[PDB]
Amino acid sequence: DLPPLPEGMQQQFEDTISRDAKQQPTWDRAQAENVRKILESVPPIVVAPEVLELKQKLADVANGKAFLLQGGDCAETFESNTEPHIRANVKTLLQMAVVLTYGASTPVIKMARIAGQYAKPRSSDLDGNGLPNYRGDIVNGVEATPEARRHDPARMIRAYANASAAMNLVRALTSSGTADLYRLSEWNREFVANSPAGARYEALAREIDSGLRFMEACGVSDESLRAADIYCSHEALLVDYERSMLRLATDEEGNEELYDLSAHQLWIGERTRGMDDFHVNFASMISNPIGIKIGPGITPEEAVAYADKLDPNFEPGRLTIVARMGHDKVRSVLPGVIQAVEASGHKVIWQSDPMHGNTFTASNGYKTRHFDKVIDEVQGFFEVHRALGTHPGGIHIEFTGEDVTECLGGAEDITDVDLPGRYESACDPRLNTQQSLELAFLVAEMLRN
Amino acid sequence: DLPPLPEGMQQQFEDTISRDAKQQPTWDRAQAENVRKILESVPPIVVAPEVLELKQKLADVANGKAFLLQGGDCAETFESNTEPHIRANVKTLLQMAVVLTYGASTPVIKMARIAGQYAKPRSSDLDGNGLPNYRGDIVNGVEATPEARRHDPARMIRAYANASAAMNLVRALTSSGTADLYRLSEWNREFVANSPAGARYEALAREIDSGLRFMEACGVSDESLRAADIYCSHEALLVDYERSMLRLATDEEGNEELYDLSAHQLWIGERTRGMDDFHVNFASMISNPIGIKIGPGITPEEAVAYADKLDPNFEPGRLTIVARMGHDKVRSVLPGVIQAVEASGHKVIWQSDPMHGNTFTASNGYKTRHFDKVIDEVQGFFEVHRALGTHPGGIHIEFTGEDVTECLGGAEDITDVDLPGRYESACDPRLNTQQSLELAFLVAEMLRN
Amino acid sequence: DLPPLPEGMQQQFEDTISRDAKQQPTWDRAQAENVRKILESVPPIVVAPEVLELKQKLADVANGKAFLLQGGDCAETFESNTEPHIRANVKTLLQMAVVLTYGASTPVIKMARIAGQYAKPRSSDLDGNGLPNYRGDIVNGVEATPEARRHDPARMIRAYANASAAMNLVRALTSSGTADLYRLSEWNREFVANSPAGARYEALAREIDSGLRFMEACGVSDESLRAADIYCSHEALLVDYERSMLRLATDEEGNEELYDLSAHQLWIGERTRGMDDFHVNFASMISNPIGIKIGPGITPEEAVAYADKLDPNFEPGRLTIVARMGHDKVRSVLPGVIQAVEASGHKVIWQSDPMHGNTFTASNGYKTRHFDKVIDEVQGFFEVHRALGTHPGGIHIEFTGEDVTECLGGAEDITDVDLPGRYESACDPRLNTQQSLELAFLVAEMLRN
Amino acid sequence: DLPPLPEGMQQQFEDTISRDAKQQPTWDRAQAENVRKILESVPPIVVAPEVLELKQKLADVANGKAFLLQGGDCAETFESNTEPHIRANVKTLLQMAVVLTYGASTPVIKMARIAGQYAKPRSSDLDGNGLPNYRGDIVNGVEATPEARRHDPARMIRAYANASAAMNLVRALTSSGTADLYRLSEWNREFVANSPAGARYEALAREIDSGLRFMEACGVSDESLRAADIYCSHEALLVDYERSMLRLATDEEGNEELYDLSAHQLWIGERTRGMDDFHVNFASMISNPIGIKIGPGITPEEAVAYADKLDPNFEPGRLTIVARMGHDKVRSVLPGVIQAVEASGHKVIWQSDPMHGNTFTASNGYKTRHFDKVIDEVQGFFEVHRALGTHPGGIHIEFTGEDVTECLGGAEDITDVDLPGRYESACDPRLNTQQSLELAFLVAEMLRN
Numbered sequence A, B, C, D: 001d002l003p004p005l006p007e008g009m010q011q012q013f014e015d016t017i018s019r020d021a022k023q024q025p026t027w028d029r030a031q032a033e034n035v036r037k038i039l040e041s042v043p044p045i046v047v048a049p050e051v052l053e054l055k056q057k058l059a060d061v062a063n064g065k066a067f068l069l070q071g072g073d074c075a076e077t078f079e080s081n082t083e084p085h086i087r088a089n090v091k092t093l094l095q096m097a098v099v100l101t102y103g104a105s106t107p108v109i110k111m112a113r114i115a116g117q118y119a120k121p122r123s124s125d126l127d128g129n130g131l132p133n134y135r136g137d138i139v140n141g142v143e144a145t146p147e148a149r150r151h152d153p154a155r156m157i158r159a160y161a162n163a164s165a166a167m168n169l170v171r172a173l174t175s176s177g178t179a180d181l182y183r184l185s186e187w188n189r190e191f192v193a194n195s196p197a198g199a200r201y202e203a204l205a206r207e208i209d210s211g212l213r214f215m216e217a218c219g220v221s222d223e224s225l226r227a228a229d230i231y232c233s234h235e236a237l238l239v240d241y242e243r244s245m246l247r248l249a250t251d252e253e254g255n256e257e258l259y260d261l262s263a264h265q266l267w268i269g270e271r272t273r274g275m276d277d278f279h280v281n282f283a284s285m286i287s288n289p290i291g292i293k294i295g296p297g298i299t300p301e302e303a304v305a306y307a308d309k310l311d312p313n314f315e316p317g318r319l320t321i322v323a324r325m326g327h328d329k330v331r332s333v334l335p336g337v338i339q340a341v342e343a344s345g346h347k348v349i350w351q352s353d354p355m356h357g358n359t360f361t362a363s364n365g366y367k368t369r370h371f372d373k374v375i376d377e378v379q380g381f382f383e384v385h386r387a388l389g390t391h392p393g394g395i396h397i398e399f400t401g402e403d404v405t406e407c408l409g410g411a412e413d414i415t416d417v418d419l420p421g422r423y424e425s426a427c428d429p430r431l432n433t434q435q436s437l438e439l440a441f442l443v444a445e446m447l448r449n
């Protein structure tokens, strides 16, 4: 310690630190404090002007002018944080985004689960055998031994390193022309040709191909077409890591603000959601755009209570409310939440997370999600919006560009016996690359009708 | 007289003047010579750099990279050469061009029957009552009296005036934003909504609407989208008018060339087509891009003979061969012509004129064309190209943006009793504005499959 | 007659026609009425959207964001209305405009004395020998005989024809790439190299050359650089010609307006300036942007009276006040006019006409202007603005791209004995092409300091 | 170990490893091998398409169409690798680049000493007291103790982390609009206003300000103006670190190549320059663009021998030869080197390093460089090129955006007693931020004449 914040925020800051943080690591305090003091001076993962630029883009999503595509790994691992893997995830993210853009007929803003998504809350404190379980590479190792599972503050520094590496690469990839949409559509036509249900989406695939041909015929210069913007996001979970990445930034107008520059967009989880707990108060204090995970037990009245705390100046696009209710309960629970939140005067982004609501333990033993149920939660998410006359702001999916077999269903007909063929996820099951693109086509079809 | 041309061309020029010109006016020579000497010094209707730019664009059409949309009034009249009329024709030309662009998936180059299309050859020398018939406003008046029907050299000057007025307006209209394609599509959706066979083209209309939305979502600046290029063309027919508009122009590289700057593109007619007559030799000598009307009696061997004379340096896009064979004879006659011309080493533009081949005298008395037969000649024109593996370069139609009833058929079901309701053409019957747009949709559908 | 205007304007229209028009032709009424009825239906020289676009650009000039370059022939002639002559005038206009743009560091909006500047008021009713003098090619011929000098209504139609020809060409020239500023600067460096006072402007010429190199080095696409906008203007003088070119136009918002579409910008002359005469009331009624010539006898109070009549809604850039006071009287008279007009709440364009104030009969007999005096009126025009803290809006000069010798002075040292070497003007003496470019450099230097 | 390279390169690779590397660290082999195996799988600092794009840009520099601005810290430190410091260096790099662009009248390609410049060769093996000296943060610590000075393989991983952090930030900064040249010029005018020799460069500063105003007046869209490309470079020195960052990359055409993706451009030093030593053979094998430091003892014949080895296919821009000869010896030695290298058929980039040739120990005790001598080596570098008629390709300077006092001279008159006021460099003395910008202005002035 040494630098104090300005007098408006310092009282609110100490008030925030004092709250109970759930899902935190048990480790040495003096050591973890040193790691935080080190990370207080490093280069941030993002810069304030990019966060301001995102808030303007997310305002367009809230007001109905754009769509939000968020997704990536469930949990990144240091082992998996490689050039081929990041390339593959960036590819599918963009490949989906172009199809989503055609269907929605609006800008698709691309957020990624990347450059920080290491912390993993989904766990019971202690595992079988009386051995503490894996809480993400920022806390401990995947190795099932008391040596590796020991909580290690140094992993915060390892995580920051891997985050800055990852974000460096996505910036590089996007500028160097792997986000050129003529090439992306060429890959999308290779998916449609080689998919078992290929002719079932070939109507829309040829139709996108016509619009891209049409663009070139009208004589447009690939000016904004040659490179795109992939923003980055993770669940703000570790008190130490997120408080270490706090930075001040003087706005170009004149006034200064406080950002958590660990990512562009941070989000609060289902388990860490308490109104008087740390994470909500941390969120309310930082000027980053913010998400909040919302499950079946949400009442309309406390969804408004969140919006009042997290969006205290009614800035459109600031708060994003993320429905993760399961395919059954989304039609039932959501309409009351939208009606009440809309009535209170908050233009939030209504985002669908059809992943963390539909997770079940299969007959095989492996944890899985069935594709058809994932799609159905989004199907019902749109139905709620169409019927209420509000704007479906975005999706939030967990995927990988690798040819893995973690979710059931899809075009390739992934059964229970296919699951141990290739399974690489650090926690939740993710959409196979085919299933990622297939989802995009169906969500595009939902955006049309 | 006073200026002689350079020694290469002067021998070829005098050789050209010496040939027989068919379809010429009977009038005073000394007087018509004065009119020509006056028009030798006026501003031209176009400038050489625009003609060079067209030859590059027409080369793309010949090599398969673009499409050619040519059309307008059959014969312009001084009475009809007005702001609302020219606007309407420019509108439909552009409205068609955008649909044709989507279907073809290539640039549609827009040529118009405008700014010079006054001469009209379709006539028997003398009419009933022993009274000379209307040969176009550049020769005599529409008024059915020996006073007005007298051949008047001064009408060449009147024609040049009206031409320069018309081309001034189309330039103005195109630059001032009546060629903004977002507005054009908004008019195309008003056509599809209000047409009796509206839902029969609404598949493609919504699909074009999606591509335009998609363009805006991808974040393209309306840079080349806000204004387009409409070129101008007429049938080079009057020796005096066309020889008066001859101009030299030093190319930016260094060498000089000889253009007939009465229009961008000139074309030779069916009646004026003799290999040793004036018009073909005039054409061969001028550096303008050139068309040539081709009917059923064409043999493959003399189509090659034309191409050798008119395109002596195998410049792709220079000659355009225009099939006007009738809906029956186009499948039969055309394949032999394409095979032979392609074999000889000439990349010409294969253009379809489904108008001047399908003209019949109706039971009413009025001269008409049936829509279905016009479409069918184009249908068969593409079939010949699809089967032979050559590129269908363009269409050549006669239309008007006015709500007139001159052709039978179409969506609105124009019968013989509808014909005297509104009939405004100086010679041939033209496509109703609905029929013009309807044709575009069907020719677009032919360009896809 | 047949069409009546809407009830707001019709009372004001008949009120306007009823006023005395000065400087009008003596000719047959029934005949001149026929000519007007003919011209009521022709294509206009410009279209309303271009006039609206100009009013927006002229608003930027009034508010200090841009400069106005107006100029061309003093009087166009049908004999002089040719491709080489129009090209030369368009060239110098643009060549000046690029230098003026660098000096002013703002957009130079290009207006031209073209496509209508045929009427010429500067004359005594009857000439020597009791023979009526030349009042411009729209009224009578230059030929010094009672045959040609007879006033001929038909010349209005001849004038419209020549106007539409001229404007067609300038549109063509500007779009076809003779307004590409890399080529224009290459011509400007040929002027500076070959001028006798070449090294006296070579500081600024190299400095403009550096900025153009710099533009290309920064990697700018010649998008708005390849083609420019030359607008057209003349003195609204003939009642018949100007009232015949009146057109209505529905604004894109909804409301309709009344334009004189003979040109983009019309202007009122010194002789035709009466507050209750025709021309001021005609001007006030038409939605075109308007100029008004102002000489030494102007009092500040009646300059405000004009502004209230001509700019009744305080639309910036609508009225342009044109100082033509002579090199001596401009410092004296102008400051009071600016102070009063600015105080009244009118953002007009303060334009300098250093031509029609400094015209004297030389010792040779020929009417001439001395270059140094022309420059000095502009020098003093800026001094008045610099001292008062107002914006010098533009210049208004009479020039020709031909190598003529009409004004004295300049770099080439044009004496009285040089004047009969080559003299081609229909009325006032014009700046030699060197003198035009030289003026631009000096006015640029005045715009800097 | 596990992956072998393709059979063309593997023989050349093992041949390269076998050579003597000078200036290497003494540390544990098995441990340093582990660090290398770890870094073999991480994300690279750059991607092959950016390196290809640089080689195209560096080809333009070699052929005379562009200039190369290389520079930054002499040695980066982990302590100094912060957001404010990197921002400051990026700022001055860009601020110089815009002035250099105006003077050169060509694209300035921006390379930086960043994201890897940690190794430092300038040292005697052992220091005073029998204690090993600082060889850069990638090898050991600055702390003057045997604990910190111990050679630590782990610092390679620390270095990679800090490199990926730095490059992430420069990418972020450049895209987020701190490379908008209107803002950069506003900072350049604040330098010129506040510099003691302010009016001595105010001629050029106003002249650049005029060109930027002119750009905006001509109506250019800030498309390529809003963001720029800063590439990254360091001295390829540590065998382990550089061999660990080797990656293969399939070219978009088809063929594959081998890059050291630790940076975009790598360069060989004066001490590590042996023709049969590791670094030259490593360089020759990698497809990165390559530099080579050249001092007074260079003979023309061995400069050709380098060029034949490093540029074996005469690819223009591939090799960059960097003259670091001192202000006296550059005029003498360089001309023979250029003549011979040019004669052999190699279009290399002739770059000037006026820093590492002019380093002397001052009377104070501190190591310094005098500004005037630095400038003079560049002055003579251009003189050699002007006289020989070859292209001066670029500069290579050591600077910092911090207000430090390390070099003598400049506008602020830095004497020996000023040196201990603020001195922050890990090795060589760097240009003060004023001295950096001042140098740019003078090198710009040299590029003009």
Ligand SMILES: N[C@@H](Cc1c[nH]c2ccccc12)C(=O)O
Pocket: A094, A095, A097, A098, A101, A107, A108, A179, A180, A181, A184, A224, A225, A226, A227, A228, A229, B217, B218, B219
């Ligand atoms: N840069 C634009 C267009 C674009 C480029 N690549 C894309 C991929 C997907 C969607 C859009 C794009 C955007 O981000 O919207």
Ligand SMILES: N[C@@H](Cc1c[nH]c2ccccc12)C(=O)O
Pocket: A217, A218, A219, B094, B095, B097, B098, B101, B107, B108, B179, B180, B181, B184, B224, B225, B226, B227, B228, B229
């Ligand atoms: N200027 C482009 C695009 C365009 C604008 N308006 C159009 C109307 C129809 C077809 C294309 C266009 C072109 O001529 O191709």
Ligand SMILES: N[C@@H](Cc1c[nH]c2ccccc12)C(=O)O
Pocket: C094, C095, C097, C098, C101, C107, C108, C179, C180, C181, C184, C224, C225, C226, C227, C228, C229, D217, D218, D219
């Ligand atoms: N089109 C821009 C730039 C331009 C092109 N040519 C010019 C000639 C002179 C001045 C400006 C220009 C303009 O009118 O301002």
Ligand SMILES: N[C@@H](Cc1c[nH]c2ccccc12)C(=O)O
Pocket: C217, C218, C219, D094, D095, D097, D098, D101, D107, D108, D179, D180, D181, D184, D224, D225, D226, D227, D228, D229
């Ligand atoms: N992007 C262009 C122009 C540019 C933007 N910022 C700059 C700063 C310096 C020099 C040039 C630029 C370039 O790199 O050349």
Ligand SMILES: [Mn+2]
Pocket: A074, A075, A356, A398, A427, A428
């Ligand atoms: Mn998950």
Ligand SMILES: [Mn+2]
Pocket: B074, B075, B356, B398, B427, B428
């Ligand atoms: Mn016809």
Ligand SMILES: [Mn+2]
Pocket: C074, C075, C356, C398, C427, C428
């Ligand atoms: Mn005059």
Ligand SMILES: [Mn+2]
Pocket: D074, D075, D356, D398, D427, D428
């Ligand atoms: Mn150094």
